[PDB]
A paper describes a structure:
Others, such as [name]-1-encoded bNAbs, preferentially bind group 1 subtypes and then increase in breadth to group 2 subtypes, similar to the [name]-1 clonotype B described here (Joyce et al., 2016; Kallewaard et al., 2016). In agreement with the binding profiles of isolated clones from each clonotype, the early intermediate of clonotype A primarily recognized group 2 HA, whereas the early intermediate of clonotype B was specific to group 1 HA. While members of clonotype A primarily neutralized group 2 subtypes, clonotype B members primarily neutralized group 1 subtypes. Indeed, clonotype A was primarily elicited by vaccination with group 2 H7N9, while clonotype B dominated upon vaccination with group 1 H5N1 (Andrews et al., 2017). Crystal structures of these antibodies in complex with influenza HA revealed that the conformation of CDR H3 is a major determinant of this HA specificity. Although the CDR H3s in clonotype A and clonotype B have very different conformations, they are able to recognize similar hydrophobic pockets in the HA stem.
We describe two genetically similar [name]-1 bnAb clonotypes from the same individual that exhibit different developmental paths toward broad neutralization activity. HA is a trimeric glycoprotein that is critical for viral entry and is composed of a globular head domain atop a more elongated stem domain. Both clonotypes were encoded by germline genes [name]-1, DH3-3, and Vκ3-20 with the same CDR H3 and CDR L3 lengths.
Residue numbers in the entry:
A (entry chain K): 1 to 30, 30A, 31 to 95, 95A, 96 to 213
B (entry chain D), G (entry chain F): 1 to 171
C (entry chain C): 9 to 55, 55A, 56 to 83, 83A, 84 to 90, 90A, 91 to 114
D (entry chain J): 1 to 31, 31A, 31B, 32 to 52, 52A, 52B, 53 to 82, 82A, ...
E (entry chain C): 275 to 324
F (entry chain B): 1 to 175
């Protein structure tokens, strides 16, 4: 019944900066029954603020909650490196008892960097078994927002490719992306030109890596 | 109490309703259970929280040392200093004692008022579609599903909707 | 044998009692204490500045330099002065310390 | 002080009843002033509260209206634990499950908050039986030059269940290695790609081998990658 | 002993924010008001009737 | 008052009912007369007693002599001792006056609450078998002998026992 | 408030009613408009005026000079003098702040009481000759001209006169 909508989805911010995370509800929320949670990478959630203003146990002074009625907020005054985590708001009503938000990610990063792109045709070993996987690789880019489309004989593929994104790197804070175009051997040999197009913020114009079957 | 609801026409309280201070207990064809009214609970919480803070924080003192030292030829002003210290002790003890005595009565009435008013908001909605069976309970003259229950609590019970069915069941 | 809806309130295992103007020992579900009746039993640093402990001496002996208080390492600042009920090393040569009480109120901090 | 220990099957046949238990240390399951909950976390459906159990001279239960039919929480006072029972399980129910405590009505005042969160038990539901991985090479070449370095890798396709561990040259090469998280293919099996970047001068002269371990099937594969 | 406090009494220190205390009338610092009372309990909830 | 019963809808009080503070005045075939509701009276008594005692008891003093004598060269601290006595006088006078004012208003409202609460109990017992004629009285729609009266004053009024008799005499007047 | 009329079942107040604190707003065949109930306003005014005066007038003080002078050898009684001043300062500030806080709550509860008490007086006259439509309004089941309106406001509504007419309009 009561839907909590946080914003922004991802929040890019350098260490030491001041962050404000908002949480807007579809209806009025009881001030006392609203809470905040922090989920560090790989660890379980952890109570950060309850009753909209009250820090939980062992919570540094950097964290402070605010709001009332429909709109709430969570402000961090000075970001420590250990504050790279996901933050969730949570509310209670007597109809939809416990509802959360989709959570804001505090991506502690900057310094945009474009990806190097590599393409890998299917191996002859895999073709013998009847399947054909073409892998397109995006290496060490930032930010994550990147478009990867497939063109087979300059016809745009759709619904037959899976992407994967690595977690944020610990040294240069970049990402890596792999898109795998999986189709049958019959469809693979039915065409000639296999291309992978990348549209990223760091690239002035889209970048295409391609090859011809049997080459 | 003064409003005559808590320990009054509502005999006891519910150890089951754990969501808040005031709420409802329903049962119908499709289940039963407790549910607290958060609108009135939050108002009491926000109100009581402001009341405790007003007593604590309207007390502000400055740095002072009470220890004064007087020799054997100053027994007069030593007894004067004792009269001042003993004078403040008598006042602050009588004030704090009477304050907590009086405001504990007021706070228990405030919770009695909220239960009374929460009861009247339900009565003035179910004018004759439900039966005041006493003990702060209403027996409906119609089938009230979980959709209908959430509307009485919400304060949006549709009287003209169920007036048709409740008229004939009253016989 | 129809549907019902009851209005009610909270109750718990609480055993706290308060006093009201009309009734004593009134059991309530929640309460708070306004009176502090606990102490740590330690003379601490007031305003972050440690006090001055005179040990076996009193102020007269400390300020004049009684041979027992020579061990008192005098710091540069303190918040309050601490004597003991058994501190009696003051004016070892009998006499009258003039304005002794006023000097204490001046050295207190 | 207070601790929560979870246990239960990590894989569920996609028709049967999911069962999980949560044993408590330090606090009491039959304690008042608290309430014991179950909450799951799926990347598709966010954080979902499932149900709660509390004892006030009597056992109560409250379930989410989204399921409201297939979930049950049973306590057990003799062992001071409480368990979960989610019947008619589907792939929507694949998520990480937490047991968690509610602490409402403390000073400063009121407010239902979750303070104690269990470690978390990931419960996947899947039809396929245990199956080993196939490993294919991702061969570099000229025209794989992006600047002055090239890229090569290994494709670990069609294995079940998680996880696989991919190392390069038995751990000798760690700089520039990206082992992507596994993706769930439509077949029900998983797929995983692992890449690495090396200078172009090393292709024809060095030696690069990726190592794949799938211990749930006692499968270990070592594959060499050579250019075209 | 080594500790910080804003209020100090001869028999020990008081770390508190309540307006009243009954430890000792002789105090040094920004201290609560000494009272002869032994229990000043302020009710916040309802009258408990299970 | 605040509850609108004392000098409210109940316009006056009764001198003939000397048994207690609150009570009943019945009128039926077997007789009439006053009688007090001891349960509601004993509560007001116990509460008011606890109120007056808590205002007197919480005042505890010690053995003190206020008489301070100073000579003609101590006029300064002589005025300081006057300021101390005069300061306490202004405080205890303003506190005592405001305490009696505020709590007398509360005490009178407390009776108003009890009278109103007694009427609501009788009304919530005689739901349909009696007619609220105002100013605190109920007209019965049936025979109510002394056995029926002492069951209303005591709290065991049997509604289904007279529900049929009162139903017939009700639509008879509606015509 | 406590009695639950202002901000309660009477959702808001009227900027139009400029004659008093409490009053009516009728709507009949020959007119409609606001009008204050002066008997309930005059009582509220006399009550509140007596309360504000009783707070001020009980503060009867005497001619006094606070300024005391002490030389550099009297810093002990000087700090005694300041402990008396800073001590009286802490008492009067706490009492005044708590007096205004607690008595404002009683004042607003007094108005809420008078509004609910006025409503419960109009309801006891139009027993079933009018329909309680909530929001503190009555809808009449019969023709009520200004002679009838003025009879309710001043408290002389003749029930048997309009009882026959209202009997048939209940339908
Ligand atoms: C409302 O106004 C009428 C005016 O007709 C008042 O009626 C008179 O009341 C007095 C007592 O106060 C009687 O002595 C008169 O005989 C009544 N009639 C007349 C024509 O004066 C009436 O009292 C007013 N309402 C209230 C509650 O006093
Ligand atoms: C208040 O109660 C104190 C503790 O006694 C216990 O609790 C009360 C509620 C009763 O149940 C009693 O039987 C219990 O022993 C007493 O020490 C104290 O005297 C009581 N106060 C007064 C005024 O009598
Ligand atoms: C509850 O009341 C609000 C009042 O605006 C209304 O909008 C809503 O439809 C009602 N029902 C529910 C289920 O919220
Ligand atoms: C309260 O809790 C105690 C716990 O020791 C229990 O023994 C007792 O029966 C409980 N009583 C009530 C009235 O809740
Ligand atoms: C006392 O306060 C000072 C700051 O003035 C701080 O450096 C010190 O660590 C504190 N000591 C304790 C025991 O808290
Ligand atoms: C005050 O005392 C409580 C008693 O447990 C302690 O937990 C708290 O840390 C103390 N606060 C300070 C500032 O010493
Ligand atoms: C009076 O009350 C008691 C207790 O509720 C009840 O047993 C009794 O029947 C009542 N009537 C009389 C006449 O005592």
């Amino acid at each position: 019944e009561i839907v909590l909508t946080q914003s922004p989805g991802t929040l890019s911010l350098s260490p030491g900066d001041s962050a404000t995370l908002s949480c807007r509800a579809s209806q009025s929320v009881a001030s006392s029954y609203l809470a905040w949670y922090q989920q560090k990478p790989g660890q379980s959630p952890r109570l950060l603020i309850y009753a909209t203003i009250n820090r939980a146990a062992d919570i540094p002074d950097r964290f402070s909650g605010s709001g009332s009625g429909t709109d709430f907020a969570l402000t961090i005054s000075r970001l420590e490196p250990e504050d790279f985590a996901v933050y969730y708001c949570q509310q209670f009503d007597s109809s939809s008892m416990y509802t959360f938000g989709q959570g804001t990610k505090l991506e502690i990063t900057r310094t945009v960097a474009a990806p190097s792109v590599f393409i890998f045709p299917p191996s002859d070993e895999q073709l013998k078994s009847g399947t054909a996987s073409v892998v397109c690789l995006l290496n060490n880019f930032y930010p994550r927002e990147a478009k990867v489309q497939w063109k087979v004989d300059n016809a745009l593929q759709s619904g037959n490719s899976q992407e994967s994104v690595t977690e944020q790197d610990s040294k240069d804070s970049t990402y890596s992306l792999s898109s795998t175009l999986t189709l049958s051997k019959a469809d693979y040999e039915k065409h000639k030109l296999y291309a992978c197009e990348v549209t990223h913020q760091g690239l002035s114009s889209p970048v295409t890596k391609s090859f011809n079957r049997g080459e | 109490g003064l409003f005559g609801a808590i320990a009054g026409f509502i005999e006891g309280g519910w150890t089951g309703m754990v969501d808040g201070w005031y709420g409802y207990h329903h049962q119908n064809e499709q289940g039963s259970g407790y549910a607290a009214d958060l609108k009135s609970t939050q108002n009491a919480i926000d109100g009581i929280t402001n009341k405790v803070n007003s007593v604590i924080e309207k007390m502000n003192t400055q740095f002072t040392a009470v220890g004064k030292e007087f020799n054997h030829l100053e027994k007069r002003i030593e007894n004067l200093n004792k009269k001042v210290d003993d004078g403040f002790l008598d006042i602050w003890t009588y004030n704090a004692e009477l304050l907590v005595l009086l405001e504990n009565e007021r706070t228990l009435d405030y919770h009695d008022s909220n239960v009374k008013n929460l009861y009247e908001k339900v009565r003035s909605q179910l004018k004759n579609n439900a039966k005041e069976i006493g003990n702060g309970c209403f027996e409906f003259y119609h089938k009230c599903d979980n959709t209908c229950m959430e509307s009485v609590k919400n304060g949006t019970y549709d009287y003209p909707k169920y007036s048709e069915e409740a008229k004939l069941n009253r016989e | 044998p129809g549907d019902t809806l009851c209005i009610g309130y909270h109750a718990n295992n609480s055993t706290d009692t308060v006093d009201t103007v009309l009734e004593k020992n009134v059991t309530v579900t929640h309460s708070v204490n306004l009176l502090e009746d606990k102490h740590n039993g330690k003379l601490c640093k007031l305003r972050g500045v440690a006090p001055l402990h005179l040990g076996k001496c009193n102020i007269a002996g400390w300020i004049l330099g009684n041979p027992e208080c020579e061990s008192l390492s005098t710091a540069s600042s303190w918040s309050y002065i601490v004597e003991t009920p058994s501190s009696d090393n003051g004016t070892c040569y009998p006499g009258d310390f003039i304005d002794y009480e006023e000097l204490r109120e001046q050295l207190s901090s | 002080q207070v601790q929560l220990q979870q246990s239960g099957p990590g894989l569920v046949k996609p028709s049967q009843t999911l069962s999980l238990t949560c044993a408590i240390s330090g606090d009491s399951v039959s304690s008042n002033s608290v309430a014991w909950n179950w909450i799951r976390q799926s990347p598709s459906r966010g954080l979902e509260w499932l149900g709660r159990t509390y004892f006030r001279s009597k056992w109560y239960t409250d379930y989410a209206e989204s399921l409201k039919s297939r979930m049950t929480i049973n306590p057990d006072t003799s062992k001071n634990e409480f368990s979960l029972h989610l019947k008619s399980v589907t792939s929507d129910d694949t998520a990480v499950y937490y047991c968690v405590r509610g602490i409402i009505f403390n000073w400063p005042l009121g407010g239902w908050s979750f303070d104690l969160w269990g470690r978390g038990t990931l419960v996947s539901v899947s039809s396929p039986s245990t199956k080993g991985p196939s490993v294919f090479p991702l061969a570099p070449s000229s025209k794989s030059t992006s600047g002055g370095t090239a890229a090569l890798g290994c494709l670990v396709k069609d294995y079940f269940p998680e996880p696989v561990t991919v190392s390069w040259n038995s751990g000798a090469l760690t700089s520039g290695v990206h082992t992507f998280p596994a993706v769930l293919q439509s077949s029900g099996l998983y797929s995983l790609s692992s890449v690495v970047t090396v200078p172009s001068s090393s292709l024809g002269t060095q030696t690069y081998i990726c190592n794949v371990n799938h211990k749930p099937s006692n499968t270990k594969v070592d594959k060499r990658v050579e250019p075209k | 002993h080594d500790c910080n406090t804003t209020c100090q009494t001869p028999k020990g220190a008081i770390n508190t924010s309540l307006p009243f205390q009954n430890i000792h009338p002789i105090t040094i610092g920004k201290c609560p008001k000494y009272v002869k009372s032994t229990k000043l309990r302020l009710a916040t909830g309802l009258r408990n009737i299970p």
